[PDB]
Design a protein around this ligand. Structure first.
Ligand SMILES: [Mg+2]
Ligand code: NA
Length: 360
């Protein structure tokens, strides 16, 4: 049939037949993001997203006809890939100093764009010069980022993700035996590796008081045992009767905590049977009211592009407003309920897309 411009109306599995085009596009998009060039960035991400969706590899400019999200700027890039087999534009970004530095400083936990720019403009070009400079000052988060840099740069496996899962369940079960813990993000979509492990937590019979304290308890608990290397808890900013905004910002979120846990090797059951029997792992935990679990899961399952298109689809095609906490129908003036992701898709009039099919 016809290919939708919306990723939420496309099935995108991990079988990418267009990695050559896709990698160059991701690099160009990333470059624009690091430069805060919104428009260009999103254009590159949309184009890369549609190609990942293809069931065949592009081998001529003709195979492009009919596909949306491919402007003249992008087709020029597709063109070069068809020929050389590589992109001179992507190549240029990979050798760009600002790009190299930002990506490097940014690979440090706690280092955002403002901090990266600062260091770049001071002349810094390597992590070593940064760490040894006896004049710079770092946030608590950045210190932790440097302290465990090595483990954090190392991808996280499914085996490690599952061991982390077990830890979370053992803790959470201790304060809410009826708590539901779901692994979200990349791993839920079937990925083999990730830079961190995310989880959604909810309790059927928890009180507004209980669900609000669980994370503090679980984290305290890990502190007592020395498993907590870094912890930051942000209180929920979601309001029960407030409808999702025009995406004004993402300051709307449930209670969550950015953590770094000490993962003992002995708890990891992989086909790899030492030195320092543990590994630091980035872990994000999210707690939400039982009745909003479907929306949170949908939101945290990603991918980012899938989440972006789900939202604009809802707004531009169905006059609905979507959030990690709700779905509002502006036409019928009512909030729509959902006990599962499928119901949410039904409400939007969208055929259900499985998690492993959301790698847009
Ligand atoms: Mg995360
Ligand atoms: Na970072």
């Amino acid at each position: 049939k016809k290919i939708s411009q919306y990723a939420c109306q496309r099935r995108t599995t991990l079988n990418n037949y267009n990695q050559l085009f896709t990698d160059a596009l991701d690099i160009l998009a990333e470059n624009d993001e690091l430069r805060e060039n919104e428009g260009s960035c999103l254009a590159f991400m949309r184009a890369s997203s549609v190609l990942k969706s293809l069931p065949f590899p592009i081998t001529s400019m003709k195979d492009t006809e009919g596909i949306p999200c491919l402007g003249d700027k992008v087709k020029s890039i597709i063109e070069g890939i068809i020929e050389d087999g590589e992109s001179s534009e992507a190549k240029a970004v990979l050798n760009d100093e600002r790009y190299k530095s930002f990506k490097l400083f940014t690979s440090v936990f706690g280092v955002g764009l403002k901090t990266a720019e600062k260091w770049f403009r001071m002349g810094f070009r390597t992590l070593s010069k940064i760490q040894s400079d006896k004049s710079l000052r770092f946030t608590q988060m950045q210190k932790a980022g440097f302290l465990y840099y090595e483990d954090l740069v190392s991808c996280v496996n499914r085996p490690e993700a599952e061991a982390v899962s077990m830890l979370v369940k053992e803790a959470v079960v201790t304060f809410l035996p009826d708590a539901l813990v779901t692994m979200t993000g990349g791993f839920r979509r079937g990925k083999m590796t990730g830079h961190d492990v995310d989880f959604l937590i909810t309790s059927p019979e928890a009180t507004e008081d209980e669900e609000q304290q669980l994370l503090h308890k679980v984290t305290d608990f890990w502190k007592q045992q020395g498993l907590l290397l870094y912890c930051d808890i942000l209180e929920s900013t979601f309001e029960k009767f407030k409808q999702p905004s025009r995406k004004v910002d993402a300051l709307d979120h449930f209670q969550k905590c950015f953590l770094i846990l000490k993962l003992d090797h002995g708890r990891v059951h992989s086909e790899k049977s030492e030195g320092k029997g543990w590994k630091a792992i980035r872990v994000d935990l999210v707690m939400c009211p039982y009745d909003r679990r479907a929306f949170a899961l949908l939101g945290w399952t990603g991918s980012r592009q899938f989440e972006r298109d789900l939202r604009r689809y809802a707004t531009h095609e169905r006059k609905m407003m979507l959030d990690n906490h709700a779905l509002y129908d502006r036409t019928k003036r009512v909030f729509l309920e959902a006990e599962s992701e499928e119901e949410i898709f039904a409400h939007l009039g969208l055929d259900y897309i499985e998690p492993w099919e959301r790698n847009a």
